[PDB]
Symmetry: C3
Subunit: 380 residues, 3 copies
Amino acid sequence: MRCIGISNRDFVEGVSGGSWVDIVLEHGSCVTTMAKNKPTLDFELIKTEAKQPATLRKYCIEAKLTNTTTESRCPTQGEPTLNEEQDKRFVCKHSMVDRGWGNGCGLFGKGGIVTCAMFTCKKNMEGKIVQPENLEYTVVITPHGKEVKITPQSSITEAELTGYGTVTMECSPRTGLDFNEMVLLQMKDKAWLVHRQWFLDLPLPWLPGADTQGSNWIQKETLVTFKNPHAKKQDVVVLGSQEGAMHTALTGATEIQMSSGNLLFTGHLKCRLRMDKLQLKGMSYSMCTGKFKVVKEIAETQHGTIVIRVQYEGDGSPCKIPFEIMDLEKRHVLGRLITVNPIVTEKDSPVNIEAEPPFGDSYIIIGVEPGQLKLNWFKK
Amino acid sequence: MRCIGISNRDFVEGVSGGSWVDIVLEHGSCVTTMAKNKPTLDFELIKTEAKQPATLRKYCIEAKLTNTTTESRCPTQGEPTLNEEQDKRFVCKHSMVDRGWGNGCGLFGKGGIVTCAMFTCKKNMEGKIVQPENLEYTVVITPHGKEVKITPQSSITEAELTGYGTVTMECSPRTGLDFNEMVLLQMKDKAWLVHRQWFLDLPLPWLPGADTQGSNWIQKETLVTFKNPHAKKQDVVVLGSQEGAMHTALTGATEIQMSSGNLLFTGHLKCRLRMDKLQLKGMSYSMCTGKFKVVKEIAETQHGTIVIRVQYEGDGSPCKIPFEIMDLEKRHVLGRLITVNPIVTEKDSPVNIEAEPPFGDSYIIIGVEPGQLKLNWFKK
Amino acid sequence: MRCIGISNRDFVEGVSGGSWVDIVLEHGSCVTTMAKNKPTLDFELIKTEAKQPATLRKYCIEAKLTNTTTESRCPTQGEPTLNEEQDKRFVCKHSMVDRGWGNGCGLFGKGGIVTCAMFTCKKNMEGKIVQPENLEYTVVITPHGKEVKITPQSSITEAELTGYGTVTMECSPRTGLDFNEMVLLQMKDKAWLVHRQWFLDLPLPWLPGADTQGSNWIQKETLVTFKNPHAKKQDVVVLGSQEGAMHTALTGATEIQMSSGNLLFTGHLKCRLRMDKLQLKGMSYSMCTGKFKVVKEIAETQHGTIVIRVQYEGDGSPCKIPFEIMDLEKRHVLGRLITVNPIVTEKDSPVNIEAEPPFGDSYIIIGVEPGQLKLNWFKK
Ligand SMILES: *[C@@H]1O[C@H](CO)[C@@H](O)[C@H](O)[C@H]1NC(C)=O
Ligand SMILES: *[C@@H]1O[C@H](CO)[C@@H](O)[C@H](O)[C@H]1NC(C)=O
Ligand SMILES: *[C@@H]1O[C@H](CO)[C@@H](O)[C@H](O)[C@H]1NC(C)=O
Ligand SMILES: [Cl-]
């Protein structure tokens, strides 16, 4: 088997009207239901993706300076000026400089000076926001299939399934990210989920999200430094590419994989199915009594939870996986289990168990004592 | 007819307990249900409104300068000063200026100078945020009516309906805006929905949202420019009203209509009705076989979806509107249809069909081939 | 009694499958249900807490200045410099100052000067954000108990209850705060809920949320002022502790009580219970006919609603509390009542009634005319 059956309590057959069913669809899993004398149905969330996220802000990480120009005046000659001061492509600075007989002036004193240099971004990176319009879930329904799209705005879909006819499916996000707080930082072919404020405070030149020209950078001086003015000239220098510094700053950040302009997430949905009055098949699994083997150690998800991948090597599958979370002592914690009714449908086949441990030290207990796994975990 | 009946699968009559019903209420539509030997009931969302949204920030778009004053010193006389430098109503600037025998000093050199001018906002605009407390939906229930209010915080209401007695109605928002990302920009009698960051980065003088005085503007220099200082005087000039520039900057922005301090939105609700155990009337509509006429071409909604207004000119109404969305090729897309179970209750009467097309090029297909409408659409 | 029974319409027993039940759990209340020949069950939300909220930003409210150092040059000697200019712990300022025979220079004129002073924060405060991972609700289920944890990410829990066996409980937040808009401001042992932008615009030196060192403050000049330079020295002064000013600025702000690193909120949940097919006990209460006494006058909650605490002194309890909200005239308002089906389970025992009045002037009407309470209220 590959598919997990719903519990008898997961559906209600009305005296009149239809039959309502609740199902939880997590990546890697398969949920099945069957009506009397009707084709068996499988439900599976295939992917969660954000398509074409809009740009919140663009940051320049490598800029080059060219066309340096300076206007210097002698005492009594007033303020210098440059047309470039009005060209947003240029970074400029006004200051005072010593003038005298050595540099063509008849008086010794401070003279005004202004220098401008053309700022050209060579490499940038941008923060993008995921809005409701960008999120899409893909669910496949297989009678024995049909691929349906689900979005935050369009959560309801009617699908005709042979044997059942029309069946309504209404799904909503269950364990994702707060896209108002978390922003997607993109540098070339890579991406990371980062906090919005951290992103907005980065000390780099920037342009608004809807900017198309990409030339009138704000806060160019974050990368530019004007050297001390000489009598009639002044040099302007720039930091080198900040690509490396960004990588360092991103050390702990969650990395997201991209598919050319679109990102893949580990989605989780809660769905309600509405169909004609029909007596459905409920399933009850016995607790596994065998030992489990850890396939992949406790790992954090992209969305503040953890997953432990295990494999059942005992007997009696399909069976329910004994699971518990307890505090520093031995007090069990009810709740915190994302993968409710965790069942292994077969032996020697990896299964993901998702959970949300309490802050501090806790223990993840899997299986019954004969070979029971006791995993430590520290959070935040 | 005007009202659309629920599907048999849209309700469940318990063996014991009550009867639960699901209904979707969109603007322009009417949903009806009827119990056995009981009065027929109509449900309709009448309006979605945001009342008294609080101010996030206030921007000055037209300022006037008065009371220009300057203190200028000769070399060796140190720094000039003005009491107004401490008055937040004034914009001030310190600089150096050439002094000499021509302007009353005994020595030629740079002297410090300071100039302040009173900044007075003449016209402002403000960004307002819609919080949960500001949103209100109005639903009318008509037996054959009763007006009920629904808010994000108070989504449940018990209403006594003759024939049914008490019936519980629980509704929640279904296809709206992300008020954490979108902000309402107001200029006089007009309003627009804009992105929060774009708004927060506007290069204009501003005051915090809770500000009541409206005089101590931050960043006055966004509108003010100090001319080059003369020996003992200096002029200060200001940009003109930025009303026009804002209109240009708002070119593509979604415009929102206001009703003196309150804004109207196109709301959409999902509601659950709970009532005494009762056998309800379910309705099944046949597919329309006639031709449709486009009343209003595909138009974008305020909330990232689209609406196509059509009219049925064929026979057999009430009937279901054949509808489909397909990609650049001909692959149909399941889901994406906001107006599920789109039915025309009568001939020659406009009906709104809402949908959320995929990014890129897609086709909206309405009606069956004999005169089928094939509408192109490009998104993002 | 202490517990409130569900209404017959609050549950549905399927012909096949299970029995689904809806319950609303508010602080201070107790909801009970009972199946035929089964133990009676009580449900109660015990607390809503945010644990270990991450820091958004840190502000310094009291800083001390030490190690003031200045480099001053004579005319013709160019720009002064200090190594400390590169030390982020120091606040520095460049300017011009008059030099002459009185201070060791051979020429009279403006000379460059630079002064730096070590900035050390002595007292800070920080804004923290509540993310989904930080919120936890504690619900106790008592047969006649079991404590279950509920979080935004883990809203579903299966609990074994003697007599019923396994029962699924799925709960979600119902009347809380928008943690994307509201931020927690913490000063020592106290805390307040404040608007994010107001917080982000405070005119104080700051450090990013993930900052651990707490020494390289941004915008130190918000607290520091450089006095007018003297020939070879210059004093730097700082504002005193801004603790008092903050308290003044926080005058109207909602205060939150803390429990050493974690905050307590008034939570409200909506829960769905799924269990084996079982005929449950529904309860119908008669309207109270007696007089009520006000225990605590209308008070605002932490989340934009109001609560009126009353006591029933009449006869017939348990009975339903007559309740209504009406506008400036006498037009009743349906909806707006958070505590739906407000019942007093006993005489002389305080009961909280929560509601969300319309903006403007409204009246809260409690009880039937013989001694009816008519409470005024103004909102926003
Ligand atoms: C530098 O001179 C101007 C300054 O903007 C610029 O247009 C040009 O491309 C640069 N090179 C030349 C022509 O010197
Ligand atoms: C300008 O002078 C002061 C400067 O603030 C101001 O109070 C006054 O109204 C203005 N007009 C006068 C009296 O000159
Ligand atoms: C001031 O001098 C340096 C400046 O940073 C500092 O390290 C030291 O602790 C202070 N006190 C002394 C040694 O003068
Ligand atoms: Cl000089």
